[PDB]
Amino acid sequence: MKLHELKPAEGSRKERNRVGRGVATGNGKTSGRGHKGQKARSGGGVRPGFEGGQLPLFRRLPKRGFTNINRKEYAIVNLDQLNKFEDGTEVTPALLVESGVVKNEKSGIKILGNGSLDKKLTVKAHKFSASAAEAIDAKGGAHEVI
Amino acid sequence: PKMKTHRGAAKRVKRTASGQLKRSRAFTSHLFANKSTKQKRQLRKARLVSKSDMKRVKQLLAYK
Amino acid sequence: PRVKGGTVTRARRKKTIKLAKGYFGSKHTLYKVAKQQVMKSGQYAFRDRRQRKRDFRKLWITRINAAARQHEMSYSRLMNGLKKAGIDINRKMLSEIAISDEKAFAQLVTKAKDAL
Amino acid sequence: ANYDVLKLDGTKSGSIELSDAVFGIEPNNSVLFEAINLQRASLRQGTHAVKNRSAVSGGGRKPWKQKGTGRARQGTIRAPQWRGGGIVFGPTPRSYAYKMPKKMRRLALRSALSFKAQENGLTVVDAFNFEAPKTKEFKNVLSTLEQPKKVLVVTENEDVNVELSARNIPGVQVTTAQGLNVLDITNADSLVITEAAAKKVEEVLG
RNA sequence: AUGGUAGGAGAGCGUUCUAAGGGCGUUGAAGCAUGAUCGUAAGGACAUGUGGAGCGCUUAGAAGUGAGAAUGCCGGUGUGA
RNA sequence: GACGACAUUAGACGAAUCAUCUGGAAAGAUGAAUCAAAGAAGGUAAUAAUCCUGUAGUCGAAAAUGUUGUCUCUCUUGAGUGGAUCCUGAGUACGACGGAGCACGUGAAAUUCCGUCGGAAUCUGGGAGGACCAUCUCCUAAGGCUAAAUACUCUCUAGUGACCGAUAGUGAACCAGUACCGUGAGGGAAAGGUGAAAAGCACCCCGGAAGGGGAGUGAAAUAGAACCUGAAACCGUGUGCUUACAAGUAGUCAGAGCCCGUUAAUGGGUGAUGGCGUGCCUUUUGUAGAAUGAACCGGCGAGUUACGAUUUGAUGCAAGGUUAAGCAGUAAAUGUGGAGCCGUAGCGAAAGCGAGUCUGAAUAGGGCGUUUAGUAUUUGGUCGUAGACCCGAAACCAGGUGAU
């Protein structure tokens, strides 16, 4: 293109709305705020959650629970993701990472039985689901808990 | 700077899969003898934050 | 970058001043009261464009009543006779005919009469 | 996807194949626009400022009593409705630069070069043999090669002699293959390359 | 189908600056003054006087981007006389 | 230590143009040439790469050394095992009471400090690992010194700007923290422009002079120092139409008569007379309102920016998408950089289980979920944190000034 024939994509750009610049805009005098009150005032408005003195929702309601600071979360992978590999291959966490199926090994890798495998391979991981191990061994293959 | 989270709401509510907020029920933790067993067991059922309240308290839990 | 209020204020006010030509005193020199009058002037003109038609129809009807009462006939009965005889002629053209050619006006007054 | 490699005489030296992936795509004008606007924004130093009512000198005391006797109520001579000063919402020192994805950047470059090639605004030569800088000789070279007023010349890595030769001519700009940019590509009407630089850009954009 | 205040949505006119392109100017630029001109509006030209050096147009991009009112601020000037 | 460019710094050299037209004067127009490691910039009677100062670049000396390369002396070519015995920081550690600081609200305070009272162990020792006990892991207090990366700029040198251009921008472009105000601490202005060149009006006339009229300089003197341009309010002099029987938000629609003659188009100016007609803004159920505000004119004068969230539009890639800091680069683009972030699976307080999970004794029944599409930057709208659309209090506190 040419700098003197520049043109943006359609729908990419709008002009901003300028308030307080006369009647014919429809945003002139009050600038959209209405006439009086707490919200017409500069810096006005009421803080979020404030209900006017009625007890807020998050004090009507009770708290419950606690957080486990040392919690185990596992990088999840299903059978339908393993179909990209070849039969007889031996898959490992490092091979998963290299293939990009797993971006982050959090506390180990876990294999879940959502999809359909249609393959035959050996797997080495930390945890398995019962359906996953069953569907691995059904077509042929082994699961070795690391 | 960063937005700050409302901690009292954070340890009162959790976020479901789609976008909703699951809460706990009030009128527990104290006198039940005036109440019936039906009320007792039914106040153990969870509920969702109403949309009318979400329209007000959305920004308090954006990082949840 | 800074932009200062140059020449646009003056042009905008000046053409209003020019619209205010012929007004009394300060109303052709001062922007505020000149502007106030021009707005009023336009509103007046808007309603007078419509009052004009009423006024002229009123004039034509007065003239036709006069022309008929020389032939011993009222406006009301003349126009009922015209309508019954089929004449779809304007009150304006009637007035002008009555002023210019009295003979033709008599000639169609005869028709308005014999249609009753 | 074949282009004639010429000599400084302008006759010929051979022909070379160039990837249509780099020089033969359909240009994406939206991405071009975004890239050009980005590069123009990145050159600004947003070094502008005004003084607000707190930074204007003086204005500590209330100039007269709240009721006064017949006057308007005021709080400082440096308030914004006063001639003295106090700007409300003026410019502030800041930056206009922003970023966008590497894939978009590469796409913009490819689209620019493809536009320049399909407009017959691409020329490729053998090496520049400049043992000393001579603006006059470079002028004669650009006369032999029927080039327009605005032309971009791309060496492989760096040639200080041809840079010095072409520095002082209006309309001419000199760049490295690594240092190519969408702005100085699009501003030009023609693009002369050395074969080595062409191959380098081909490999780093393909 | 088209009255309209809080208010929501949309499309536009102008101001200063920047990029690129293409132009105007001592055979007289911008500003100022006048005019019976053009456009649905914001508003845009042309002609003539004054003035004596800078300024438009196209596309895009940034804003200290449009005042008649705030017992508003600053200057000039009236009225009462 | 011979130590081998402070920056090699004041400084010096530093290419290349003539003519005609208009002009008061050309750098402009026309035409023909030239230099370029120099087409950055500014002046010159108007707009100059080739007229001047200059620029690129080259040559350069004192205080100097770049503080840089073997650099005289001088350096540190290690002495390993057991550690059995001796030493290894006392009113200290530690404790109670009262307090403070640590993200922690003074208390189980774990950890670290102040005051008052007490007050030890010594390598088979002692301390820590969020009360306390035991096992394990780590360390060895009560002695000291320590560059770099980091923070700021009254200043200095060299520069930059989608910063201001005289009510702006420093309070201050000039006589500025000055005239001026105040006992004093302190507060605190207004005020730029002849012309290219002063060639800044010889001389004559009116006049006491100021002022002026001629003459003259000049391109221009309604460019004459109250000096570029010279708006409006306001003050006047002349005139074309009109007005002393008339009730008025001063205009509007109609309309004779009189005068003129345009951006020449079913034109302009005035207006005998008729009809209609209680200003604007704000606040109000409602305002001609005897409710508010504005003497007039001009100028100035109010939703903005950063960061984050959310949602729309645009684009790129897509079961994947994306870099942050830093580094190289012209204060750019770009390249590199994969620690991290979102998504690809949820349910449950949690252990945990997993396309299911939670409840339940039970799989039942029900709740949330599955039965695809996200992610990065950007545009608009809104919100949040910041003074957050602008002006405006009475008052509170801290430090000072005053008994003329």
- CATH number, domain of A84, equals 3.100.10.10
Chains contacting B with at least 3 CB pairs below 8 Å? A
Q: A79 burial class (0-12, 13-18, 19+ CB within 10 angstroms)?
A: buried
Shortest distance between the Cα of B16 and any Cα of chain A, in A, equals: 16
The helix-helix angle for C31-70 and C8-19 (nearest 10°) equals 30
**D185 vs D181: CA distance, rounded Å:** 6
Greatest CA separation for chain C: 87
Which range marks the domain in which residue D139 is found? 1-206
Q: Is D2 helix (H, G, I), strand (E, B) or coil?
A: strand
Which range marks the domain in which residue A88 is found? 75-143
Whether A1 and D186 have beta carbons less than 8 Å apart is answered as yes
**D150 vs D138: CA distance, rounded Å:** 14
If we measure between CA atoms, which residue out of C66, C93, C63, C91 comes closest to residue C79? C91
Whether B46 and B25 have beta carbons less than 8 Å apart is answered as yes
List the structure tokens of C47: 């309603």
A8 interface with D at CB cutoff 8 Å = yes
Quoted resolution (Å): 2.3
Q: How far is the CA of D170 from the C1' of F35 (A)?
A: 14
Q: How far is the CA of C99 from the C1' of E18 (A)?
A: 74
If we measure between CA atoms, which residue out of A93, A80, A99 comes closest to residue A146? A93
For B28-35, which contacts have Cβ atoms below 8 Å and span 24 or more sequence positions? Answer: B28/A62, B29/A62
- The reply to whether A96 Cβ lies less than 7 angstroms from strand F is no
Pairing mode of beta strands A75-78, B21-23:
unpaired
Distances (CA, A) of C104 to C82, C86, C88, C114, D8: 14, 17, 16, 16, 102
Touching status, chains B and C (3+ beta-carbon pairs under 8 Å): no
Whether D5 and D11 have beta carbons less than 8 Å apart is answered as no
Domain tally, chain C: 1
Partner residues linked to D173 by β-bridges:
D152
A47 interface with B at CB cutoff 8 Å = no
Contacts with A49 from chain B: Cβ below 8 Å: 6, 56-57, 60
Pairing mode of beta strands D190-194, D122-125:
parallel
Q: Which of residues 144-203 of D touch strand F (CB under 7 A)?
A: 164-165, 167-170, 178-183
Q: H-type helices in chain C, by residue range?
A: 8-19, 31-70, 75-85, 91-100, 102-114
- The reply to whether A44 Cβ lies less than 7 angstroms from strand F is yes
A82 Cβ neighbours under 8 A, 6+ residues apart: A91, A117, A119, A121, A123
Residue recorded with tokens 């490819």: D110
**A11 vs D185: CA distance, rounded Å:** 26
Touching status, chains D and A (3+ beta-carbon pairs under 8 Å): yes
Residue D188 falls in which region: left (phi positive, over 0), alpha (psi -120 to 50) or beta: beta
Alpha-carbon torsion angle B51, B53, B55, B61, nearest 10: -110
Tell me the one-letter amino acid at C56: F
Contacts with D187 from chain A: Cβ below 8 Å: 3
Nucleotides of E under 7 A from a protein CB: 6-12, 14-17, 19-21, 31-36, 42-44, 58-68, 70-74
Sheet containing B21-23: which strands, arranged edge to edge?
Answer: B13-15, B21-23, B47-48
Contacts with A12 from chain D: Cβ below 8 Å: 30
Q: Is D5 helix (H, G, I), strand (E, B) or coil?
A: strand
If we measure between CA atoms, which residue out of B4, B11, B18 comes closest to residue A61? B11
Q: How far is the CA of D49 from the C1' of F401 (A)?
A: 37
Residue D76 falls in which region: left (phi positive, over 0), alpha (psi -120 to 50) or beta: beta
**D179 vs D194: CA distance, rounded Å:** 15
Is the four-CA dihedral B3, A47, A42, D67 of positive or negative sign?
negative
Closest partner residue to A3 among D27, D29, D187, by Cβ?
D187
Contacts with D181 from chain A: Cβ below 8 Å: none
C112 Cβ neighbours under 8 A, 6+ residues apart: C73, C77, C78, C79, C80, C81, C82, C85, C87
Tell me the one-letter amino acid at C84: K
Helix (H) or strand (E) holding A130: helix A130-139
Q: Are B13 and A62 inside 8 Å of each other by CB? A: no
Q: D145 burial class (0-12, 13-18, 19+ CB within 10 angstroms)?
A: middle
Q: Are A62 and B56 inside 8 Å of each other by CB? A: no
**B19 vs B8: CA distance, rounded Å:** 19
Closest chain B residue to A67, measured at CA? B11
Q: H-type helices in chain D, by residue range?
A: 20-23, 29-42, 102-118, 135-144, 160-167, 182-186, 195-205
Closest partner residue to A2 among D27, D30, D186, by Cβ?
D186
Partner residues linked to B47 by β-bridges:
B23
Touching status, chains A and B (3+ beta-carbon pairs under 8 Å): yes
Tell me the one-letter amino acid at D197: A
If we measure between CA atoms, which residue out of D48, D60, D59, D130 comes closest to residue D94? D48
Is the four-CA dihedral A45, A47, A49, A55 of positive or negative sign?
negative
If we measure between CA atoms, which residue out of B24, B22, B27 comes closest to residue B39? B27
List the structure tokens of C105: 């006006």
Measure CA of the first residue to CA of the last residue in chain B; give whole Å. Answer: 18
**D138 vs D125: CA distance, rounded Å:** 14
Tell me the one-letter amino acid at D126: D
Angle (nearest 5°) at CA B49 between B47 and B51: 130
A23 Cβ neighbours under 8 A, 6+ residues apart: A29
Chain B from 19 to 48: CB within 8 A of any A CB? 23-26, 28-29
If we measure between CA atoms, which residue out of D2, D1, D6, D48 comes closest to residue D193? D6
Whether B61 and B6 have beta carbons less than 8 Å apart is answered as yes
Distances (CA, A) of A36 to A27, A42, D147: 16, 11, 69
If we measure between CA atoms, which residue out of D154, D161, D150, D142 comes closest to residue D181? D154
Tell me the one-letter amino acid at B25: R
Half-sphere exposure (Cβ direction) of D42: Cα atoms closer than 13 Å: 11
CB atoms within 10 A of CB D62: 12
A11 interface with D at CB cutoff 8 Å = no
- Residue A122: phi, psi to the nearest 5? -105, 145
Contacts with A55 from chain B: Cβ below 8 Å: none
Closest partner residue to A8 among D33, D115, D187, by Cβ?
D33
If we measure between CA atoms, which residue out of B55, B59, B64 comes closest to residue B12? B64
Q: How far is the CA of C2 from the C1' of E15 (A)?
A: 10
Measure CA of the first residue to CA of the last residue in chain D; give whole Å. Answer: 14
CB burial of C51-79 (b: ≥16 within 10 Å; e: otherwise) equals eeeeeeeeebeebbeebbeeeebebeebb
- Residue nearest F169, CA–C1′ metric: D50
List the structure tokens of C113: 């009469």
B11 interface with A at CB cutoff 8 Å = yes
Which range marks the domain in which residue C52 is found? 1-116
Q: How far is the CA of D136 from the C1' of F20 (A)?
A: 30
Distances (CA, A) of D168 to D135, D136, D138, D162: 7, 10, 11, 11
**C26 vs C45: CA distance, rounded Å:** 22
Alpha-carbon torsion angle D53, D57, D60, D66, nearest 10: -60
CB pairs under 8 A between A and D: 20
Domain tally, chain D: 1
- Residue D110: phi, psi to the nearest 5? -60, -40
